[PDB]
Assembly symmetry: D3
Homo-oligomer: 244 residues x 6
């Protein structure tokens, strides 16, 4: 039985949960839920793996989004239909600033919309902006956990390869739009690349839902293209505590 | 060992394979592989589950893409790095034409680019067009299997909900761009909506790779009666038979 | 006396025809019609010269479009009003791929929309895609006569000069949008430039009409001419008529 | 022998001509050239028919463009190559303003760019504007024969049907972009639709060439020789 | 007070139908003082307004401030009060090597590098000046013997990156504007300024008449009274 | 002294080491804002740019007007940056588009809908017109300290007062296609208000390593009327400035 098309969940499964932690990788869901009380597997369908847990006596959902705006848009919509009102994305990321180190934690205030799904919720003029309370929770959680943290703009790309101006590819080329784009974002102070935040932030900020975004830095793109975690995950859990 | 960042595969894993069948759902991969000879699981990481099998003596890969152009773009790029040159997508779809029945099979000649990843490969002016040999193989395979087939344009959307003009949602609203859009595509002859083809077709057609798209119709957005889980499974099985039969003609 | 504004034709003139072969140049119309049965002149108004003929007992029209999407859009609309449902464009062309040779035949599956008129029928996201049956008929006709055939994407430009990144012009300037564009299309596997197909294919694909396109390669810029063209003409003409046979 | 790819002309053939009158229809060329001295045919290829004549001792070209911006862009480019520096468009037109009557004369100051070829010369932000000298010459030539004249903006469409919001067609449909567009142009004071001026005006204004356009009103969808005299009279002021 | 920003009433205008609109509020009184019976009306924000008389007819002088946004407020509110003709007077640089300090530029139409023009008409619409206004300005410049250039102006929402200036805090110019000055130069664009695309589009699309004249103060490559004298003399011809 | 910048008529000396500016739209508001701080001194007045210096907790602060709109804002911000300013706090007036927002309420902008043109001269449309986290935090925390009725969220920032804010009580009575129905759309999307400077300010600062915040007082509620019939935000911007020195 399911009250939604993709996730395989009923409202009753959520046990009153109003906050979801949303990693990209289904395999990371169990790990994150294990940091909390009474973790229980709910469902696994396609790229959507969902567990329920408890935090200071209140139910919390952990559900994977898969890679990219499109699958993220499905998980967020269906979770919203089941009663989730606050979404915290926890990701991995490639830093594009020389002064950001592997293992650092980045909190996103807003995202460069290098995606398509965000346009399905708001025109390009609309900012892919995080909720102020969620952002505050993540920043304060980062202090509590103890991590080297940066706060600012992230570039959110519909591709891992040409949209992040990667050249370690089959074609070894990048379309005109993205030729020289990395150095452009770098000059504009953009911190990092990832793949889900523009859709998440736009769809939430334009629909009365709260969203925030934190990621662990797994490569620095000024040094290396292909990578080569816990601070970031402890932070998203600690932030959830503050948003309940 | 992996030659690539996401798929967990090496060139050795492919055993000379140059064609891949690419469903969206990782759960479909084993079922598709079971239509061929000596299938073996290769890897499963994130939404990317891959098997290898033989078709008429030759190695073939089956690898899931996940939902959307972004994860599709990863799978296609990484399979291309490993040596794949021909990609056949097999999907599920919602028909938007009144005359297309649940059970029908759709072969996509080109797609309306309502996605974002395609733009990362070619500007919007560029057609998200299928390879002629792949499309031919799918059409011919449909005739071999015995199916009611429709050939034409598909709308490929970055969303399941507002991009396909669904109002049955949390917010119940659809942004200006997509308001009244389903009626527009209907009048323009578009057969259906899905979520991966604009990215697949554009990225292949602009990089010297061959791609084709086939789907079974599991629902019609104009009809009143919504079929159950079973009826939809029979339709999937049919389109799946067609994609394997098509693959035989492209080796 | 006429059922349409420009073509100077009535439904009666078409004698039940449902297929039109559509070259750009009025001079080619008679030549194409001459490969078919019972050819006869119909009308000539501006760049629209029309002839009718017969293949396997069915009426066929041959009608020129002029240069560009604007005049093509007029001919296709008015032919559709008169009852045409399948359109086969036949052109001669220059190639942008180093391995497409003069004498080769190109069958277009879809076009890069570097025109304006296509946007009057569908938004840019919609593909300027040929009909499958038409494309199939063209490729099959090309094989039956042993042509060296290339099947793929064509770039369809509203200009002969800057849109095709030509600098041998009065100004010697190409606008930012088109600076470096030929190299980009080349890298993307685009076969050639022409000027009508984006409008033809988009307007047909978005209005329930069937369209296809074939062209003979008469020059190749990236490889650096009278008898070759006439020979190449005759061959792509042979193909479009043989394709038309299969589509009736 | 030809200096250009399409027109079939050499610089020599122009005999020092620097101004061209550019109608759409080849069948209008000789009629226009006949109003001037020593009219002689030069060439005829596809929709490009060219004649030379003389106006107060100076050679002048009359050359047809065919229908639409693409065809027009070829003719203007190749005439420019041959030495033409001033282009005067002569047309017949409908109108979309009820106060504009059949027999009135329209002088276009600039065009709404509903075409595609203009974008091959300048981005959309750039105005499809007529040369001030040409517009002046046309307006004052119109006044001098007592013509009723409207001066203002014309909408320049790559189509005759949906871009001019016509529904009396095969599909009976008009794409979202153009749905409600005629009422919008009407409200913004646009006089009329035609099909060539956005291309002509943009390619000339962005390339140092002078261009102008006059048209005679022959129909008006909102309602239930003169212009030819004007273009020729205007031409003699611009030599 | 009727209108929200200008603090003016219809009665304040005493039947005026024309306004001279400089950018700088401090230049308003200077322009008014050249005509008869100059009287201050109001001063709010960047909008300083004076009334004067020219050949026994009331005229307005009202500043716009810098940019399309504030210009759009002044023109709207003045039109609400009965103004139907707007003459912009500016000071300007130039991007063409042959255009000297002391030269006067008359703008036929503007490259729309602004945002506000889009709130009145889509980009396809030309930011074109009224023919009568442009004629009056050109004739008034002949009248006083000024060296006049007539043509296209690039109208930018910024003084710095939109005019491809690199002598700035960041030293960065966004992709869109990198190499843009050279492009405008090759296209024959005379100068940059910051209000004309909004002024011309908003007027040409609402039945209002607008023109623009500017004196050249500097040249990127290498008489404010003279331009002011022209704008006042042109105004006499437009009453 | 010869001005260090083209429009503002200021020298670096004039700033006395100031690194923060409070930036109202109206030049006539500058003196009023500077009067709430220590040692206020008029610096200059040119075009729409009136500038004062003052002191907060012994630190020099600039108050400078921007005029209406992105273009004039882009001049003031660029030239102040050149002079040494690294933090900008806009204080404005606004029309609320949500029904329960009262005239006099204080709105703090997290990011803006870019309905302007000048922002495109700094970053392509995909880039967010987002406020600095530290500045926004200071404004929110200052508003709480004085117990103001405050709303935090997205603002629509328009290049026009009339059609871009979907006002119909105008000379033409017309609104171009792009903006027809637009207010309802922003309302449904949770946008709080309209104003005219923040998209440019926020984009040009976030893309150039400058910190910016945005606060405005509501002067009309657009669900009720287009034009009103006829200082919490100000206390807040000064208190927030104190926290950012």
């Amino acid at each position: 039985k399911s009250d939604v098309f993709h996730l395989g969940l009923t409202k009753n499964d959520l046990q009153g949960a109003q906050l979801a932690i949303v990693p990209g990788d289904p395999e990371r869901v169990e790990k994150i839920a294990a940091l909390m009380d009474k973790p229980v597997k709910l469902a696994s369908h396609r790229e959507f793996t969902s567990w329920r847990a408890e935090l200071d006596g209140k139910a919390v959902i952990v559900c994977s989004t898969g890679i990219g705006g499109p699958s993220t848009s499905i998980a967020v919509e269906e979770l919203a239909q089941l009663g989730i009102r606050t979404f915290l994305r926890i990701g991995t990321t490639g830093a594009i600033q020389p002064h950001i180190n592997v293992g650092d934690v980045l909190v996103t205030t807003a995202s460069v919309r290098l995606d398509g799904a965000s346009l399905h919720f708001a025109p390009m003029e609309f900012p892919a902006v995080a909720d102020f309370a969620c952002t505050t929770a993540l920043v304060e959680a980062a202090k509590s956990i103890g991590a080297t943290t940066h706060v600012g703009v992230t570039a959110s790309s519909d591709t891992f390869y040409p949209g992040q101006e990667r050249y370690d590819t089959y074609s070894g080329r990048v379309v005109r739009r993205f030729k020289g784009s990395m150095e452009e974002w770098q000059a504009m102070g953009v911190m990092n690349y990832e793949m889900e935040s523009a859709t998440l932030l736009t769809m939430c900020a334009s629909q009365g839902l709260r969203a925030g975004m934190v990621a662990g830095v797994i490569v620095n793109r000024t040094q290396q293209e292909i990578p080569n975690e816990s601070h970031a995950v402890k932070i998203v859990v600690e932030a959830a505590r503050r948003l309940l």
